[PDB]
Amino acid sequence: SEFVATTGDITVSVSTSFLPELSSVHPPHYFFTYRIRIEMSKDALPEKACQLDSRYWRITNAKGDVEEVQGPGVVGEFPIISPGRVYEYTSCTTFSTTSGYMEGYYTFHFLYFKDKIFNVAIPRFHMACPT
Secondary structure (H helix, E strand, O other), X not given: OEEEEXXXXXXXXXXXXXXXXXXXXOOOEEEEEEEEEEEEOOOOOHHHOEEEEEXXXXXXXXXXXXXXXXXXXXXXXOOEEOXXXXXXXXXXXXXXXXXXXXXXXXXXXXXXXOOOEEEEEEEEEEEEOOX
């Protein structure tokens, strides 16, 4: 399914997928991939060009266990987003429950504005196994 959040001229889109071949009911291991799309509208000023510094994830399963993940980059990269550009990457996550959800944000800095740093919301997206 598809989840979206926009901040300023930037939109973050998340598509999720359940992978049953890697998922078991015992031990409870529910494997999901997610594909993230970070895009800046064509109509934005080229001044707003910005570079991804870091990520913050809050991951919650269906029994109230929570995990925080924070670190530099996404999958080892620090992409630059400028008007019309799209950065896409894929990652995965496991839950010990049939559902879980994730939310957080990316921290960006402007390339052409001295020390202007800002956070871009990642939409909350739920992952749920039908069965």
